[PDB]
């Protein structure tokens, strides 16, 4: 039982920690980053005739 | 000028895109790097590739296709493959979540946030090209990803770009083999959604492709590699008119005008006659006569449809290679004299001939034959209603006892759209016999 | 050039400063004897902020040691680095402390303040231009409180233009050992609030909880606790000595932490603390550090600000990292808990990045906290003060030295003022 | 002749001086020593360098820049860095005491005794030069030392010299990131002091520099140098007109006249279109037309503004490299015909074109693309008032609750100057809307 007590020593782990977290995107691309929200977050490619958000 | 854009949706419909692009670079002699030998062909991108590839001043041929996918596995392994340096990273539209064969999941949940990027891709390809005859969509009816995502994009590209053609290519569901029981669910759903927008949809079945190979190609154990090259050849033949010339040149617009009789139904069947093994071709001979008989032999079709139960409406033969009109017109005249061939009396003429002098070549390390005279037989007949007749009694049982509906309704859907498909199909068949009724 | 001179006070600060300087010596690569073994050019350059040059490349510490009891100093002198200290700064008294706050503040200091004033001003003229001074001591400590309160007062008027960095340890809330420590603490903090500009609050129980938590070695030495706290004190001082794309001046920092004058109590926070096998079970990346440095369990100063909210937060990041991770981490934590900040001030985070990793690890950081968690602290001592002043226990001594209760009344009002002063701003 | 003097203030202003000067030395082939190889370009100091560097009879280049800061740390490490032998020791103006983010600390406490010294530098710089078109000022609004010290000197540079131009560049306060909450206080303290003297201010924001970087440069973990290389490339392009020639040569005086409409507002926005990764440009092609739209796409601006929420006033494109007016004039003809682009109808013309034949080169050990057709897009729009609108509410709260002044009034100020600047700002938005009012 050497590992037990040397693990069971003191108290047992408990989360009083700050619940920090980052929501990730739905894409694996290290450049595109879109979630359930903010779906217009990606690199816009380069169109030649119609400018940005023509419609 | 004269060009088109290819679309390959679905991890099923991507390896077929892998083969055809691989096949295409061969007759052009495109090195996997993306540059020719010391022979001078580079420029602003104007040669045999200009319809297919984009070899600009950078000297690298860029295929004019977009590979959209929903699972990173297959799209990354090809991105680690042989021609990945040729391929553009974000036209290999990689995927992160799956539709789980659910058309609606692919159509609604993820499809919204990706189509804009695809819309971003398509306009960038649409803006650079000049002729832009149409689009080459590779998909599948029973698509775990092919079904839902193709439907949403074709809806979006229909509303904004409705003046160009839309060429659809999907595996027809196996009538008796079902890799998924949800497959009929979405398959009819796509048909009723695609009836009112799609321009030209061409279907095919793998079993008969497998039926052919151990009949005359004589392989009891083929592979997808064998399968995809066959269809990859098929699209190569139809695109040979686009690259090469011949006695007369024909185009998809002529195909659109001359094959589909009436609105709604635009579903012809393709065939290729000189399917044979190399050794069988070795000590035998090919000519227009027997291949004309072969292409009109019922068992040579890749779809489980027997012509004498139906009647022909549209037919087209695309002769690629060394052929003279003399034997052709006489042969097709004798075909016209044939009595078993029962065309619909509405059309006295129903054949579209395409002559190309370029002999179709073999693929290195391949299994096809060395053909001089080839033909792609895209035709249409009334013997197809049984295929949708099979699907309805398949579906009507399933819907009455509403199996698996809890999945679909669980993610936010209902029964009305499922209801609309059945009379859309019921409208589809009821049109089939009345045009069959003379 | 701007330098620092240290003061070592109380019998804890003797224990603190001993560990404090040896950590610095081991960091900079000087042997215990004092002959520096040239290993890093940057620490060769910017050691002058703290040490002066002696003969033969010996780096004389500019720290002053003050006490009354030789044995503690004898232990300090006999320590592994007592040789690097001078007999010059060894100034002390002939009296037994008793650690009465009054004897050290009025009786014993009277004949000792003159000498230590003479001391500190000689090393003051030895160097050119200070940033300021820093003091290690205790608020509940007996002898250090008396000397410190006297000296901080005198250094105020004579150099009113420098840093009054005070570094005091808060005794254990559950038990003060010294029963008259609450008298000592209440006396000390009264003159601390107006005289100082910076104060770090440290508690042993939280430090004991750290051994309970991550050190996981059951029985440490208090020197081990000194090792931990010295690392925190060293970490904030790594700013000045080391180059990098960070602003190090405490003035560049203090104006950024201090909205209003009454703010002097500041709470440290430290970065990766690791157990027996998790050194090779940890994937050292910024998100885990930021998670770990912002852990209520990682906190060691007083208690959990969970009961209150966050006024100003400042953390210095040591290692080969970049501004993007801290930026995206800052957005994460900002969006994580915006409500637990105060609507009084947004963007209350001030970040610094040190590109020079420590000796023993690459990724590290130190945090300094300003929240509403000190209410529980001085509210605790308030009931202690009121109860012990209810019946004037242990007072006949303090009346003997000449101290009166009116001092206690107006002193407690000052703390009671700070009770409302904290509460009104946040609550 | 055609030359200028550069000023770098603050440790925020010095690394970019290092980085940019690290850039300029490359295209000229400047060796670390300062001398060329045995090839002959040295003389009285009149060649490619004569506008930037002073390669006198000693034979080695002296950049015409002065690095001023208040701390010896970052200036010594560069004094011990790579290029210190070129750089002039006391042109590397160091300081021993910091302003502690306080505008007035760097404006009253120590500035008085040290500006005279830098006054000695500038006149000894001024006397040697001949053409002395203007000054290149790099600083930061949220300057711990950049804010206050620059404000005093520009006042003294304004009063003694009011006949020549002065070019200021500062990182703008981040819209939602604040590494200091006294960065707000000094900001309009700087701007209200500078509005009545400054000629033209160009600003950038780090976050969108990053947002570009992990969008198209594909670097999720850039370095602090990459920002400096990008902005260093930015000024390199604007100075390429100075260095080389092209179809037409344009000077800062023209940019001053044709950009700013009216006094006060002189705050346009720059943008460099061909920002892409090397592997992306590897198999893609660039021309003026598509990059023209790219620099007009709002997400490519490094300032957090929606141009659709504002209206366009002026725009400047500098085509550095091989371009011809033909495709340029037709392409810009199209952008005028565009409807989403909303210029003010006051100016039928609002564009300034600059053609330079030189293709922008790649920095060794770099991360940028391989650009032969490049443009930095200087433009000013009415969508900028939100940033100051973003500001003033950040301020009206803090001044009302009256924070940190004990630091400021502690070392000697009053609240009147903080008051005057708020209607100075309030004058700006009412100015900004009324010019937006047509
Ligand atoms: N087009 C094509 N179809 C194949 C291939 N191999 C098997 N199939 C058939 O095509 C169907 C694939 O459809 P789906 O499973 O919905 O494909 P998907 O929507 O892209 O997503 P997945 O479920 O991951 O495959 C299968 O049922 C097979 O019967 C192939 O190489 N190409
Ligand atoms: N050195 C040391 N001090 C400790 C320790 N634990 C608690 N302390 C307390 O830390 C306080 C600070 O030390 P000093 O200020 O020098 O104490 P002092 O003025 O000599 O007076 P007394 O507390 O009466 O002994 C002491 O009062 C101790 O009670 C420890 O482990 N080591
Ligand atoms: N323009 C520019 N800005 C930088 C650079 N490096 C960091 N910055 C940003 O600019 C800000 C610098 O402003 P200040 O802190 O006031 O700098 P300072 O006035 O020169 O004096 P210090 O406070 O001591 O640095 C930092 O907060 C950084 O976010 C740089 O190299 N160039």
Structure token digits, residue C390: 């209810």
C-alpha B85/C-alpha B34 separation (Å) is 8
Coil, strand or helix at C335: helix
Coil, strand or helix at B136: strand
CA dihedral C368, C373, C377, C379 (to 10 degrees): 150
The interface residues of chain C toward chain D in range 166-185, judged by CB-CB distance below 8 A, are none
C-alpha B37/C-alpha B30 separation (Å) is 9
Q: Which helix (H) or strand (E) holds D99?
A: none
Report yes or no: D379 and D203 within 8 Å, Cβ to Cβ.
no
C-alpha D47/C-alpha D105 separation (Å) is 42
Q: Is C342 left (phi over 0), alpha (psi -120 to 50) or beta?
A: beta
- The closest CB to that of C295, out of A17, A21, A22, belongs to A17
- Pick from C264, C172, C276: which is nearest to C217 by CA? C276
Report yes or no: B407 and B180 within 8 Å, Cβ to Cβ.
no
Q: What phi, psi does C169 have (nearest 5°)?
A: -105, 130
Ligand 1 pocket (Cβ < 6 Å) reads: B 10-13, 15-16, 71, 101, 140, 142-146, 171, 179-180, 224
Residue D203 CB-half CA count within 13 A: 22
Q: Is there contact between C and B if contact means ≥3 C-beta pairs under 8 Å?
A: no
Question: Could you tell me if A10 lies within 8 Å of chain D, comparing CB atoms?
Answer: no
Q: List chain C residues with CB under 8 Å of A22.
A: 287, 328, 332
The reply to whether B253 sits in an annotated binding site is no
In sign, the C-alpha dihedral spanning C115, C121, C122, C124 is: positive
- Pick from D340, D434, D339, D346: which is nearest to D385 by CA? D434
Q: What phi, psi does D271 have (nearest 5°)?
A: -165, 135
Largest Cα separation within chain D, whole Å, is 67
Report yes or no: D381 and D261 within 8 Å, Cβ to Cβ.
no
- Pick from B257, B232, B258, B150: which is nearest to B198 by CA? B150
Coil, strand or helix at B43: coil
C-alpha B52/C-alpha B63 separation (Å) is 6
Residue C392 CB-half CA count within 13 A: 11
Residues linked to residue D7 through DSSP beta bridges, in sequence order: D66, D137
- Pick from D206, D161, D194: which is nearest to D265 by CA? D194
Question: Could you tell me if C262 lies within 8 Å of chain D, comparing CB atoms?
Answer: no
The set of residues, in sequence order, having a beta carbon less than 8 Å from that of D50 and lying 6+ positions away, is D1, D3
Residues linked to residue B378 through DSSP beta bridges, in sequence order: B316
Closest C-alpha to ligand 3, atom 1: D12
Please tell me the distance in Å from B346's CA to the nearest CA on chain D: 51
Question: Could you tell me if D175 lies within 8 Å of chain C, comparing CB atoms?
Answer: no
Q: What phi, psi does C171 have (nearest 5°)?
A: -60, 170
C-alpha B219/C-alpha D374 separation (Å) is 58
Burial class (CB in 10 A: 0-12, 13-18, 19+), D236: buried
The reply to whether C146 sits in an annotated binding site is no
For ligand 2, say whether the CB of C290 is within 6 Å of any of its atoms.
no
- Pick from B127, B103, B161, B355: which is nearest to B240 by CA? B355
Question: Could you tell me if C212 lies within 8 Å of chain A, comparing CB atoms?
Answer: yes
Give C323 Cα–ligand 3 centroid separation in angstroms: 12
Report yes or no: C105 and C114 within 8 Å, Cβ to Cβ.
no
To the nearest 5 percent, what fractions of chain A are helix, strand and coil? 15, 0, 85
β-bridge pairing B134-140 and D312-321: unpaired
Please tell me the distance in Å from A5's CA to the nearest CA on chain B: 44
First to last CA, chain C: 43
Ligand 3 pocket (Cβ < 6 Å) reads: C 245, 247, 252; D 10-12, 15-16, 71, 98, 101, 140, 142-147, 171, 179
Sheet holding D200-204, edge to edge: D92-93, D65-68, D5-9, D135-140, D167-171, D200-204
- The single residue of D27, D254, D290, D417 carrying the catalytic annotation is D254
Structure token digits, residue D178: 């604040």
Please tell me the distance in Å from A37's CA to the nearest CA on chain B: 10
Coil, strand or helix at C260: coil
Give C14 Cα–ligand 2 centroid separation in angstroms: 10
Instruction: Looking at the CA of C205, name the nearest ligand.
Output: 2
Which is the closest atom of ligand 2 to the Cα of C16?
1
H-type alpha helices, C244-341: 250-257, 286-293, 323-336
CB count within 10 Å of CB D94 equals: 19
Chain D residue closest to C261 (CA)?
Answer: D406
The interface residues of chain C toward chain D in range 105-124, judged by CB-CB distance below 8 A, are none
State the angle between helix axes of C181-195 and C405-426 in degrees (0 to 180), rounded to the nearest 10.
Answer: 60
Coil, strand or helix at D358: coil
Method: cryo-EM
Q: Which helix (H) or strand (E) holds B356?
A: strand B351-356
Integer CA distances (angstroms), D44 to A28, B144, C325, D50, D123, in order: 58, 75, 50, 9, 20
Structure token digits, residue D14: 């010095």
β-bridge pairing C59-61 and D5-9: unpaired
Residues linked to residue C63 through DSSP beta bridges, in sequence order: C6
Which is the closest atom of ligand 3 to the Cα of D170?
1
In sign, the C-alpha dihedral spanning B402, B403, B405, B408 is: negative
Annotated binding site of D for GTP: 11, 71, 140, 144-145, 179, 206, 228
Coil, strand or helix at C351: strand
Structure token digits, residue D431: 């100015």
C-alpha D115/C-alpha D324 separation (Å) is 48
Residues linked to residue D319 through DSSP beta bridges, in sequence order: D355, D375
Report yes or no: C246 and C319 within 8 Å, Cβ to Cβ.
no
Resolution (A): 6.5
Integer CA distances (angstroms), A14 to B406, C282, D370, in order: 39, 18, 54
C-alpha B46/C-alpha B32 separation (Å) is 19
The set of residues, in sequence order, having a beta carbon less than 8 Å from that of C282 and lying 6+ positions away, is C272, C274, C288
Residues linked to residue C265 through DSSP beta bridges, in sequence order: C199
The reply to whether C219 sits in an annotated binding site is no
CA dihedral B78, B83, B84, B90 (to 10 degrees): -100
Q: List chain B residues with CB under 8 Å of A34.
A: 113
Instruction: Looking at the CA of C143, name the nearest ligand.
Output: 2
- Pick from B334, B182, B351, B195: which is nearest to B263 by CA? B195
CB contact under 8 A, C337 and A18: yes
Residues linked to residue C60 through DSSP beta bridges, in sequence order: C52
Residue B24 CB-half CA count within 13 A: 32
Report yes or no: B61 and B29 within 8 Å, Cβ to Cβ.
no
- The closest CB to that of D285, out of B34, B56, B89, belongs to B56
Coil, strand or helix at D55: coil
Burial class (CB in 10 A: 0-12, 13-18, 19+), C232: buried
Residues linked to residue C167 through DSSP beta bridges, in sequence order: C136, C200
Catalytic residue set of B? 254
Please tell me the distance in Å from A17's CA to the nearest CA on chain B: 31
Q: List chain C residues with CB under 8 Å of A21.
A: 332, 336
Question: Could you tell me if A52 lies within 8 Å of chain D, comparing CB atoms?
Answer: yes
Report yes or no: B177 and B134 within 8 Å, Cβ to Cβ.
no
Structure token digits, residue D306: 């929606």
């Amino acid at each position: 039982n050497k590992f037990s007590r040397q693990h069971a020593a003191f108290g047992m782990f408990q989360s009083h920690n700050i619940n920090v977290t980052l929501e990730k995107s739905l894409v694996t691309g290290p450049d595109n980053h879109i979630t359930h929200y903010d779906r217009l977050n990606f690199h816009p490619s380069y169109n030649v005739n119609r400018p940005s958000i023509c419609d | 000028m004269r060009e088109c854009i290819s679309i390959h949706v679905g991890q099923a419909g991507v390896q077929i895109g892998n083969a055809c692009w691989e096949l295409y670079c061969l007759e052009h002699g495109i090195q996997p790097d993306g540059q020719m030998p010391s022979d001078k062909t580079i420029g602003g991108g104007d040669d045999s590739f200009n319809t297919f590839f984009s070899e600009t001043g950078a000297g690298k041929h860029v295929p004019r296709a977009v590979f959209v996918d929903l699972e990173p596995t297959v799209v990354d392994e090809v991105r680690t493959g042989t021609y990945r340096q040729l391929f553009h990273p974000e036209q290999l539209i990689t995927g992160k979540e799956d539709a789980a064969n659910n058309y609606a999941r692919g159509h609604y949940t993820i499809g919204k946030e990706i189509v804009d990027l695809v819309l971003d891709r398509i306009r960038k390809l649409a803006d650079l090209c000049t002729g832009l005859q149409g689009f080459l969509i590779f998909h599948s009816f029973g698509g775990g990803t092919g079904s839902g995502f193709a439907s949403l994009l074709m809806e979006r590209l229909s509303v904004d770009y409705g003046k160009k053609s839309k060429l659809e290519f999907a595996i027809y569901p196996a009538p008796q083999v079902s890799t998924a029981v949800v497959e009929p669910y979405n398959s009819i759903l796509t048909t009723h959604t695609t009836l009112e927008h799609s321009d030209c949809a061409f279907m095919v079945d793998n079993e008969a492709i497998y039926d052919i190979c151990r009949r005359n190609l004589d392989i009891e154990r083929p592979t997808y590699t064998n399968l995809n090259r066959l269809i990859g050849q098929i699209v190569s033949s139809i695109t040979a008119s686009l690259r090469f010339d011949g006695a007369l040149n024909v185009d998809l617009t002529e195909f659109q005008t001359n094959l589909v009789p009436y609105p709604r139904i635009h579903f012809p069947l393709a065939t290729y006659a000189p399917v044979i093994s190399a050794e069988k071709a070795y000590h035998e001979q090919l000519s227009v006569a027997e291949i004309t008989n072969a292409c009109f032999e019922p068992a040579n079709q890749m779809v489980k449809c027997d012509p004498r139960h139906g009647k022909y409406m549209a037919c087209c033969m695309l002769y690629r290679g060394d052929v003279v009109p003399k034997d052709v017109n006489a042969a097709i005249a004798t075909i016209k004299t044939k009595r078993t061939i029962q065309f619909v009396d509405w059309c006295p003429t129903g054949f579209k001939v395409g002559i190309n002098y370029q002999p179709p070549t073999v693929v290195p390390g391949g299994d096809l034959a060395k053909v001089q005279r080839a033909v792609c037989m895209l035709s249409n007949t009334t013997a197809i209603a049984e295929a949708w007749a099979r699907l309805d009694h398949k579906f009507d049982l399933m819907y009455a006892k509403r199996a698996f509906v809890h999945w679909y309704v669980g993610e936010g859907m209902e029964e009305g759209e499922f209801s609309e498909a059945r009379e859309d199909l019921a409208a589809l068949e009821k049109d089939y016999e009345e045009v069959g009724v003379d | 050039m701007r330098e620092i001179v240290h003061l070592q006070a109380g019998q804890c600060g003797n224990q603190i400063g001993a560990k404090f300087w040896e950590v610095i010596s081991d960091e900079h690569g000087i042997d215990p004897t004092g002959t520096y073994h040239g290993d890093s050019d940057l620490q060769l350059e910017r050691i002058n902020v703290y040490y002066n040059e002696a003969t033969g490349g010996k780096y004389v510490p500019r720290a002053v040691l003050v006490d009354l009891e030789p044995g503690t100093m004898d232990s300090v002198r006999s320590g592994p680095f007592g040789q690097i200290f001078r007999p010059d700064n060894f100034v002390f008294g002939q009296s037994g402390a008793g650690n009465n706050w009054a004897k050290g503040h009025y009786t014993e200091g009277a004949e000792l303040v003159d000498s230590v004033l003479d001391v500190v001003r000689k090393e003051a003229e030895s160097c050119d231009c200070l940033q300021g001074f820093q003091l290690t001591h205790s608020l509940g400590g007996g002898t250090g409180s008396g000397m410190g309160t006297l000296l901080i007062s005198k250094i105020r008027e004579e150099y009113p233009d420098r840093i009054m960095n005070t570094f005091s340890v808060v005794p254990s809330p559950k038990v003060s050992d010294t029963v008259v420590e609450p008298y000592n603490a209440t006396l000390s903090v009264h003159q601390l609030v107006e005289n100082t500009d910076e104060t770090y609050c440290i508690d042993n129980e939280a430090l004991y909880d750290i051994c309970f938590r991550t050190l996981k070695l059951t029985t440490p030495t208090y020197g081990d606790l000194n090792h931990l706290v010295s690392a925190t004190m060293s970490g904030v001082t790594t700013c000045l000595r080391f180059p990098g794309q960070l602003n190090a001046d405490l003035r560049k920092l203090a104006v950024n932490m201090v909205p209003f004058p009454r703010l002097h109590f500041f709470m440290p926070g430290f970065a990766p603390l690791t157990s027996r096998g998790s050194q090779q079970y940890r994937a050292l990346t910024v998100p885990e550090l930021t998670q770990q440095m912002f852990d209520a369990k990682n906190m060691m100063a007083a208690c959990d600000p969970r009961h209150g909210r966050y006024l100003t937060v400042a953390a210095v990041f040591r290692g080969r990292m970049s501004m993007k991770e801290v930026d995206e981490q800052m957005l994460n934590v900002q969006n994580k808990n915006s409500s637990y900040f105060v609507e009084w001030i947004p963007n209350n985070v001030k970040t610094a990045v040190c590109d020079i990793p420590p000796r023993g690890l690459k990724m590290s950081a130190t945090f300094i906290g300003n929240s509403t968690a000190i209410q529980e602290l001085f509210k605790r001592i308030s009931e202690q003060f009121t109860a012990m002043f209810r019946r004037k226990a242990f007072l006949h001594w303090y009346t003997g030295e000449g101290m009166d209760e009116m001092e206690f009344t107006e002193a407690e009002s000052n703390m009671n003022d700070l009770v409302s002063e904290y509460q009104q701003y946040q609550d």
